[PDB]
Amino acid sequence: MAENGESSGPPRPSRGPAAAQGSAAAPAEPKIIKVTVKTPKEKEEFAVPENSSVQQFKEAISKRFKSQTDQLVLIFAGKILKDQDTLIQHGIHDGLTVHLVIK
């Protein structure tokens, strides 16, 4: 992105225009799994694409819920519903309940 200074010239290769595609019949597995997150206020469920990482969902509650992000984590049966694993990969199979805590 920017880093502190950059004394690197042009690389050997050169990525240019190609068939990146993106607007031509392209689904994304809308298996929106339901995730019930408990916060210090009430119980609110969230919708997320079955193929999403916690890093994205983690920033979702911070902006919408307005509380935290780094320390913000979810306690699923003792485990840590966080970036360490994938919410759709174990934290939520199709509607699970987890406690929210900021450590």
GROMACS .gro file of C-alpha atoms in nm:
model
  103
    1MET     CA    1   0.000   0.000   0.000
    2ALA     CA    2   0.252   0.266   0.111
    3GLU     CA    3   0.488   0.131   0.381
    4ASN     CA    4   0.773   0.356   0.501
    5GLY     CA    5   0.958   0.439   0.177
    6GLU     CA    6   0.986   0.227  -0.140
    7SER     CA    7   1.313   0.195  -0.337
    8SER     CA    8   1.185  -0.091  -0.557
    9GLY     CA    9   1.173  -0.043  -0.937
   10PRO     CA   10   0.942  -0.219  -1.184
   11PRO     CA   11   0.919  -0.598  -1.152
   12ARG     CA   12   1.020  -0.831  -1.439
   13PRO     CA   13   0.662  -0.927  -1.532
   14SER     CA   14   0.375  -0.676  -1.564
   15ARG     CA   15   0.011  -0.759  -1.481
   16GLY     CA   16  -0.206  -0.574  -1.735
   17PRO     CA   17  -0.564  -0.600  -1.864
   18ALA     CA   18  -0.696  -0.958  -1.883
   19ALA     CA   19  -1.016  -1.164  -1.842
   20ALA     CA   20  -1.076  -1.072  -1.475
   21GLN     CA   21  -1.451  -1.121  -1.541
   22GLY     CA   22  -1.695  -1.045  -1.256
   23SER     CA   23  -2.015  -0.937  -1.435
   24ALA     CA   24  -2.132  -1.248  -1.624
   25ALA     CA   25  -2.331  -1.521  -1.442
   26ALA     CA   26  -2.129  -1.560  -1.119
   27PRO     CA   27  -2.299  -1.687  -0.801
   28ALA     CA   28  -2.136  -1.677  -0.455
   29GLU     CA   29  -2.304  -1.951  -0.246
   30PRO     CA   30  -2.574  -1.750  -0.067
   31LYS     CA   31  -2.607  -2.012   0.207
   32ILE     CA   32  -2.659  -1.722   0.449
   33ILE     CA   33  -2.612  -1.900   0.786
   34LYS     CA   34  -2.778  -1.734   1.089
   35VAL     CA   35  -2.550  -1.637   1.380
   36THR     CA   36  -2.705  -1.538   1.716
   37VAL     CA   37  -2.459  -1.301   1.890
   38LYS     CA   38  -2.526  -1.205   2.255
   39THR     CA   39  -2.405  -0.856   2.353
   40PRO     CA   40  -2.424  -0.643   2.668
   41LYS     CA   41  -2.764  -0.501   2.563
   42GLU     CA   42  -2.978  -0.765   2.388
   43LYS     CA   43  -2.969  -1.073   2.160
   44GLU     CA   44  -2.936  -0.994   1.787
   45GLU     CA   45  -2.889  -1.248   1.505
   46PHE     CA   46  -2.675  -1.171   1.197
   47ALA     CA   47  -2.683  -1.306   0.840
   48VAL     CA   48  -2.353  -1.411   0.678
   49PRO     CA   49  -2.254  -1.595   0.362
   50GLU     CA   50  -2.174  -1.962   0.439
   51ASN     CA   51  -1.832  -1.887   0.284
   52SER     CA   52  -1.708  -1.588   0.489
   53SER     CA   53  -1.422  -1.541   0.739
   54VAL     CA   54  -1.462  -1.399   1.092
   55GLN     CA   55  -1.233  -1.104   1.003
   56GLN     CA   56  -1.516  -0.959   0.789
   57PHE     CA   57  -1.796  -1.041   1.037
   58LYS     CA   58  -1.576  -0.910   1.322
   59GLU     CA   59  -1.564  -0.562   1.164
   60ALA     CA   60  -1.938  -0.588   1.087
   61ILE     CA   61  -2.050  -0.580   1.453
   62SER     CA   62  -1.791  -0.312   1.538
   63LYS     CA   63  -1.933  -0.070   1.277
   64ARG     CA   64  -2.305  -0.161   1.314
   65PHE     CA   65  -2.309  -0.261   1.684
   66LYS     CA   66  -2.047   0.006   1.769
   67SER     CA   67  -1.836  -0.146   2.049
   68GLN     CA   68  -1.494  -0.288   1.953
   69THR     CA   69  -1.310  -0.515   1.706
   70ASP     CA   70  -0.960  -0.634   1.809
   71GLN     CA   71  -1.055  -0.730   2.167
   72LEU     CA   72  -1.408  -0.812   2.046
   73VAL     CA   73  -1.445  -1.191   2.017
   74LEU     CA   74  -1.718  -1.458   2.050
   75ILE     CA   75  -1.713  -1.745   2.301
   76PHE     CA   76  -1.863  -2.048   2.123
   77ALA     CA   77  -1.889  -2.338   2.374
   78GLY     CA   78  -1.557  -2.220   2.525
   79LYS     CA   79  -1.384  -2.195   2.185
   80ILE     CA   80  -1.312  -1.850   2.034
   81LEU     CA   81  -1.547  -1.762   1.748
   82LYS     CA   82  -1.290  -1.524   1.600
   83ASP     CA   83  -1.046  -1.500   1.308
   84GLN     CA   84  -0.862  -1.808   1.440
   85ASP     CA   85  -1.135  -2.014   1.268
   86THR     CA   86  -1.420  -1.960   1.019
   87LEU     CA   87  -1.769  -1.874   1.148
   88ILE     CA   88  -1.931  -2.080   0.872
   89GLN     CA   89  -1.670  -2.353   0.933
   90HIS     CA   90  -1.770  -2.425   1.297
   91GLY     CA   91  -1.899  -2.125   1.493
   92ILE     CA   92  -2.232  -2.133   1.306
   93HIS     CA   93  -2.366  -2.440   1.123
   94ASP     CA   94  -2.712  -2.286   1.066
   95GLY     CA   95  -2.812  -2.083   1.376
   96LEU     CA   96  -2.589  -2.125   1.684
   97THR     CA   97  -2.572  -1.911   2.001
   98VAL     CA   98  -2.245  -1.764   2.135
   99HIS     CA   99  -2.153  -1.509   2.406
  100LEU     CA  100  -1.973  -1.184   2.310
  101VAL     CA  101  -1.677  -1.074   2.526
  102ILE     CA  102  -1.393  -0.821   2.475
  103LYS     CA  103  -1.060  -0.948   2.614
   0.00000   0.00000   0.00000
